[PDB]
Write a structure and sequence with these properties.
This is part of a larger assembly, with chains A (46 residues), B (206 residues) and C (353 residues).
Chain A: H1 15-20
Chain B: H1 6-9, H2 25-44, E1 51-57, E2 63-69, H3 72-76, H4 81-94, E3 98-104, H5 112-124, H6 129-143, E4 147-154, E5 163-170, E6 181-190, E7 193-202
Parallel strand pairs in B: 2-3
Antiparallel strand pairs in B: 1-2, 4-5, 4-7, 6-7
Helix pairs in contact in B: 2-4, 5-6
Chain C: H1 2-22, H2 24-39, H3 47-87, H4 90-115, E1 125-131, H5 136-156, E2 159-167, E3 173-181, H6 185-189, E4 194-201, E5 210-221, E6 236-241, E7 248-253, E8 258-262, H7 268-305, E9 310-315, E10 320-323, E11 329-330, H8 333-338, H9 342-351
Parallel strand pairs in C: 4-9
Antiparallel strand pairs in C: 1-3, 1-5, 2-3, 4-5, 6-7, 7-8, 9-10, 10-11
The chains are: A little secondary structure (46), B alpha+beta (206), C alpha+beta (353).
The structure holds magnesium ion (27 copies).
Chain B binds 4 RNA strands through residues 1-2, 9-10, 12-13, 24-26, 147, 149, 153-155, 159-162, 168-179, 185, 187-196, 205-206.
Domain KH type-2 (chain B): 38-106
Organism (chain B): Escherichia coli (strain K12)
GO molecular function (chain B): mRNA binding; rRNA binding; structural constituent of ribosome
RNA sequence: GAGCAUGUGGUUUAAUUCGAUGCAACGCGAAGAACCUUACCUGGUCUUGACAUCCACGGAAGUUUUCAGAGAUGAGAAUGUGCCUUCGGGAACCGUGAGACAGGUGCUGCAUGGCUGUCGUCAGCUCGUGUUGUGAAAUGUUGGGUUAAGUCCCGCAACGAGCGCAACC
RNA sequence: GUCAUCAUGGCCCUUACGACCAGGGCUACACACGUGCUACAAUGGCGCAUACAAAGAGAAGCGACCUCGCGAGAGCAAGCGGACCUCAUAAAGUGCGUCGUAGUCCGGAUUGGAGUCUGCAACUCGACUCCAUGAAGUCGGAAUCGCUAGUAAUCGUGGAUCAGAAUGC
RNA sequence: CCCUG
RNA sequence: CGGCACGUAGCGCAGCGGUAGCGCACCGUCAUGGGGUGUCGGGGGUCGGAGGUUCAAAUCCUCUCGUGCCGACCA
């Protein structure tokens, strides 16, 4: 178990919201299999 | 877009009904229940005997069942005990006296139902679907069908994403009503899901 | 008698759950040990360690005999219920009902003492929902989380009112501070401090790509804003000196060590009054700095624990709800987001997280 | 705008089942919710089981009842005891005993089949061979006229064909 | 879009998310939206008399005639598995009278009493009849929709679903 | 005028 | 410390014996695929607090506690 390095530095109001506004709890992008972000240049096995 | 059924649009033109009895409103509902029962039972124990069509008619308190199939020898067995026991069981099912005619069908891969049964058989036994589609294509062209289109749909080859592949040659005029478009579907219960197959065969203008 | 059967079954199940969460045999082991070194007499030759031993002894023995008498109560109420079903002795069945209610209330007092162990647990609370760095998806998730928490507060019976609500321009609300009033509100809601992980097919995205947004619920009790007491004449050091009559007043607070001078006015009394207001202002400033320093130290500790703030995970794509801290799971996402978190909050509160 | 019908969102409750929720959800699935209907809630019950098969055991199946309970159900009383049959039999059907299993309107339409909406009944979409370009590709399908239409004439490195258009209904 | 018509890979449950019964709910209500019906009237309301259709359904059904009831309906009881009998006398129209521009002889919501029918049962929660009451509404902002001919607009009728229960289709 | 990574 | 200027809706501001007003903002509907801008239509104020006169007080008076300004000079 290792400490997380938050990018807010010295937190003096609220660290939970600080870790939200840190990149750790960021919203994450999913690569669609088909649809909008659909095109794959090369396959997983090709 | 979605297509209209070729048979379903061509009943009144060129395709005969596969049930040609008459009924009033009183006997209609359990009549179709009886037809559904006989058809599922005969397809269940004629699944291995190359069945194509089941045409049934009620003349008067009785049932005539004509089975258009390609292997009447294995249908009738060893001097007809198979068709005799099927006759007695279907008489039990329909509650009326029964008699069965077996119609041998020339050119089984010119029949549309047997092409669907064949292609679903290779999709069960894991033969490569594209090869089997081609194999049906030169079957139709070698026996002289004027046109054929075969379509397969689903998780082809165990893919994670389902898709549809269809092959066509000759004329497949779905919009021409007088055309003999013998069309039929089937399903494959593969270990990776359900694979649908559809067959269109154009066999002449009228 | 069917509710009585279900009720005894419920008490048996919750007693087993309480034993599992409390680790009864381990506390019994320290109880036996504390009894042993109490039996050796040197422990009362040292005063303060006997103080600690008396405290831990009383706590351990009380928990142990409580769980033991609930075992005895469960078994003898079950046996006498079996008597009361067949013999149909109505007074003895009423005795069973009374003793069963007493046992249930006394185990309720035990689990009560465990779950509301906080000093601020009885007070009302300020509960805040804030969306993450995601966008409108996080905004919508914060808003409907606020809806769910309102539904939970109304179902519990806590009186709610929205102190502030910062909304998003498209949909949802960016942040919201809510006063939840009622007895034991902070104790009931104190396990909600942390992060919720939404995974769902986002409607705001054009392609229907699923989104993994985050929100935080932060609860803090309504502490009493105590009055700032005035300073003492002995605690002050008052000097007078010539301005640059010795009307200049230098007031020095000695126990902290802070001075304020004033020399602008001919009146020494005016100089002293301005110096005394400067004294009060600096004392208020230093008290605020001390409070902010303590808050920053607590934030240092909870930023150190960091990733542990991610407490809850809703996978709406696969339709599963997960508390990572207690590790518990369920599938009724619509009930969870309706506000049926009673099982989760009880699991967390018996965990002590 | 008004009143009412109906659907939806939100709210609330025990539940206000669930699905559809740009156009292409919103008198939609539902061509019709007082009970069943209905998958929701409360309360009362059961567990090889309401719905099938297998094995063993006791039997007809059925027909009138009585009591208690809201009913499911639990207990009790009368009548039938056949059907075909190597008096070996054996099964329509009633209960029991287990386990192999039945079961789910539980989750995933972002694993699918089938079926449908949509652009749009818009007039396009391509292929074979040939040719040009190193190549992705291009031609055919463009040009001038014409038509509801890639419908048609002629010209044209294109020549033909198919799904479309049209007709056959 | 549909794993809630069905089928189906995988996952979850198997004295329970499975099964049975009763009651309640799906019909609630500060509110917002969608689609409809009826109005705000004299090109009309009310009263009296009298013309002109098409299509469809009917056996656990359509149900004529006669009698009673103001009525919804009730009792008796033909024909019809139907170009035969019933649903079923269409309405708008036409002729006359009154109303004379008023919240009115418009509107018909709401509410009270009294009933009929289906269904075990109409309270939550049906439809219809009578009597009584007579609400908003005097043509509707930004905005917005349908329609090129037997069309829009208006006036009726039938059917599916269904024991009963349409302003919907 | 703009269109969450 | 002495004067003198103001306490008006969430905010900024008018009104200073009988009447509470304007703008931004909030809500609801349109317009947009959606947001903004825009369009339609609403609401919201012990008039800083207290008490005195007057038929009546936001307006007149007193005190009060806030904020601003001007002077707290010769020695
Ligand atoms: Mg179609
Ligand atoms: Mg579902
Ligand atoms: Mg709904
Ligand atoms: Mg949805
Ligand atoms: Mg419609
Ligand atoms: Mg019901
Ligand atoms: Mg239950
Ligand atoms: Mg899809
Ligand atoms: Mg070349
Ligand atoms: Mg083109
Ligand atoms: Mg080209
Ligand atoms: Mg041209
Ligand atoms: Mg052409
Ligand atoms: Mg050309
Ligand atoms: Mg055509
Ligand atoms: Mg759709
Ligand atoms: Mg969906
Ligand atoms: Mg029920
Ligand atoms: Mg409904
Ligand atoms: Mg009138
Ligand atoms: Mg009908
Ligand atoms: Mg009026
Ligand atoms: Mg008028
Ligand atoms: Mg009409
Ligand atoms: Mg009906
Ligand atoms: Mg910007
Ligand atoms: Mg000087």
């Amino acid at each position: 178990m290792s400490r997380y390095q938050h990018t807010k530095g010295q937190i003096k109001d609220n660290a939970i919201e600080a870790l939200l506004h840190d990149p750790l709890f960021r919203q994450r992008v999913e690569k669609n299999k088909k649809g909008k972000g659909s095109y794959m240049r090369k396959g997983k096995h090709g | 877009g979605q297509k209209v059924h070729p048979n379903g649009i061509r009943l009144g033109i060129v395709k005969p009904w596969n049930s040609t009895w008459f009924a009033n409103t009183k006997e209609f509902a359990d009549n179709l229940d009886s037809d559904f029962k006989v058809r599922q039972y005969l397809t269940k124990e004629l699944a291995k005997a190359s069945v194509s069509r089941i045409v049934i008619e009620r003349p008067a308190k009785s049932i005539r069942v004509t089975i258009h199939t390609a292997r009447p020898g294995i249908v009738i067995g060893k001097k007809g005990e198979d068709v005799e026991k099927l006759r007695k069981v279907v008489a039990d099912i329909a509650g009326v006296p029964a008699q069965i005619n077996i119609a041998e069908v020339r050119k089984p891969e010119l029949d549309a139902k047997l092409v669907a049964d064949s292609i679903t058989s290779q999709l069960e036994r894991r033969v490569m679907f594209r090869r089997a589609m081609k194999r049906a294509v030169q079957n139709a062209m070698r026996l002289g069908a004027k046109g054929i289109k075969v379509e397969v749909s689903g998780r082809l080859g165990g893919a994670e994403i389902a898709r549809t592949e269809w092959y066509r040659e000759g004329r497949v005029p779905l919009h021409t009503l007088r055309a003999d478009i013998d069309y039929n579907t089937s399903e494959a219960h593969t270990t990776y899901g359900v694979i649908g197959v559809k067959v269109w065969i154009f066999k002449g203008e009228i | 008698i069917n509710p009585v059967n279900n009720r005894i079954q419920d008490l048996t199940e919750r007693s087993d759950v309480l034993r599992g969460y409390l680790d009864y045999d381990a506390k019994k082991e320290r109880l036996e040990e504390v009894n042993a070194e109490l039996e050796q007499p040197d422990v009362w030759n040292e005063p303060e360690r006997a103080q600690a031993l008396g405290k831990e002894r009383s706590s351990l023995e009380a928990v142990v005999d409580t769980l033991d008498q609930m075992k005895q109560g469960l078994e003898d109420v079950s046996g006498l219920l079996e008597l009361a079903v067949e013999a149909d002795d109505e007074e003895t069945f009423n005795e069973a009902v009374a003793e069963l209610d007493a046992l249930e209330e006394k185990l309720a007092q035990l689990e009560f003492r465990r779950m509301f162990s906080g000093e601020y647990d009885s007070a009302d609370c300020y509960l805040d929902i804030q969306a993450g760095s995601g966008g409108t998806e996080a905004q919508d998730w914060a808003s409907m989380l606020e809806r769910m928490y309102l539904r939970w507060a109304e179902s519990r019976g806590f009186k709610t009112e929205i102190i502030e609500e910062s909304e998003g321009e498209v949909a949802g609300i960016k942040s919201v501070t809510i006063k939840i009033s009622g007895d034991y509100a902070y104790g009931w809601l104190r396990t909600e401090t942390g992060v919720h992980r939404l995974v769902r097919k986002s409607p705001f995205d054009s392609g229907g790509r699923r989104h993994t947004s985050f929100s935080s619920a932060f609860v803090y009790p309504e502490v009493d804003d105590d009055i700032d007491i005035e300073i003492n004449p002995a605690d002050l050091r008052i000097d007078v000196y010539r301005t640059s009559t010795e009307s200049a007043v230098r007031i020095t607070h000695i126990p902290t060590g802070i001075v304020t001078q004033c020399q602008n006015d001919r009146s020494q009394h005016k100089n002293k009054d301005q110096a005394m207001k400067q004294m009060k202002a600096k004392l208020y400033e230093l008290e605020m700095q001390k409070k902010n320093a303590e808050k920053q130290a607590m934030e240092d500790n909870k930023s150190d624990i960091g990733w542990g703030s991610q407490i809850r995970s809703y996978v709406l794509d696969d339709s599963r709800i997960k508390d990572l801290r207690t590790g518990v799971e369920t599938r009724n996402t619509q009930a969870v987001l309706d506000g049926s978190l009673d099982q989760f909050i009880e699991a967390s509160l018996k965990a002590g997280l």
